[PDB]
Amino acid sequence: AFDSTWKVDRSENYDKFMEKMGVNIVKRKLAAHDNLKLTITQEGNKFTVKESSAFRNIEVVFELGVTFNYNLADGTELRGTWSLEGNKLIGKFKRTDNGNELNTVREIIGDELVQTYVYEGVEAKRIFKKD
C-alpha cells in the first residue's frame, strides 16, 4: 500500500542533530515537543510527501530524481533531491546559509516508515508508524 498517514513514533539523536543544524536553543525547546509526520501518497511513479510538524506543514512533491526547495518555519532555507530505488528512497538536502549537505533517507518497512538523517556527520534516526 505505502500510501498513508504516518506520524512520528520514535526519534533518536533528533535534538543532537537539530542542535547541529545550527538551529537555536529555543527552536529545540519546542522541537522537544513538536513531533513530525507524513501524509505520503505516491501516484504515477511519483511521491507526494506531505511532511509536517508543529513548526508548519510542508508539501514536498517529487517524481524521481527531482530537486526542490524546503524551508523551516523559524526562517531557514534548504534544498534537496529525492529518488526511488529498490522500494526505498534516497534523498539529500543542503543548507544555503552554512553551506553544507544533509543526507536524508526514507524507507517503508514493517508497516512502518523509517527515516534517517545525516548532518555533515551526525546520524539521527526517526521512525514513524501508521494511523
Swiss-Prot record:
Residues reported to bind tetradecanoate: 82, 106
Result for mutant: residue 64 to G: Reduced stability
Protein name according to UniProt: Fatty acid-binding protein, intestinal
Outcome of swapping residue 63 to G: Localized reduction in stability
Positions carrying N-acetylalanine: 1
Disulfide bonds: none
Gene: FABP2
Family recorded in the similarity comment: Belongs to the calycin superfamily. Fatty-acid binding protein (FABP) family.
Organism, scientific name: Homo sapiens (Human)
InterPro entries xref list: Calycin, FABP2, Fatty_acid-bd, ILBP, Lipocln_cytosolic_FA-bd_dom
